[PDB]
């Protein structure tokens, strides 16, 4: 029988940190960067959520999932408490790095191998080699060197 609507969270887990930035008016908008990975990870995750055959994710399989949709709620969790100006700054401050989801991009990753298994197995894909590699965290740096003008900006009008 399986959960059902369980699954989409997985997937929603995804875009809604995605969609969050996308309102939030605050450094959260280099966050696309980060979320553009794990946008491409979710898509194989919806063409199961509908294929043309009655499908039957058993719980062994949802396990997987449930360990994914954890790294998604963190990064937008982190991200409804930088809602506050105050609370943004307040964060950073006490946070010593620029990057906002430097840690959190690791965990997408120990978790999205935890499907590649089921995903290797079942849709017969790499998930490794396309996605994931070998600089990950060292690309945020990038992006985070502009979010650092970010708050100068604010200076002027
Ligand atoms: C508060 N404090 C911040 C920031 C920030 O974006 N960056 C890059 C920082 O380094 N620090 C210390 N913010 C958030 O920006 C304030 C928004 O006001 C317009």
Known sequence: GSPGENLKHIITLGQVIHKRCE?????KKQCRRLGHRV?????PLEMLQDQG???VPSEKLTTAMNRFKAALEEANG?????????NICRFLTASQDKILFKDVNRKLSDVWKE??????????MPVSPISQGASWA????????????????????
């Open 23 to 27: 309102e939030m008016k605050y450094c």
């Open 39 to 43: 946008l491409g990870l979710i898509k």
């Open 53 to 55: 055959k009655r499908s």
């Open 78 to 86: 982190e991200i409804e408490k930088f809602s506050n100006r105050s």
């Open 115 to 124: 499907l590649s298994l089921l995903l290797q197995v079942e849709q017969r």
């Open 138 to 157: 060292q690309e945020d740096q990038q992006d985070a060197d502009e979010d650092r003008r970010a708050f100068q900006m604010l200076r002027r009008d």
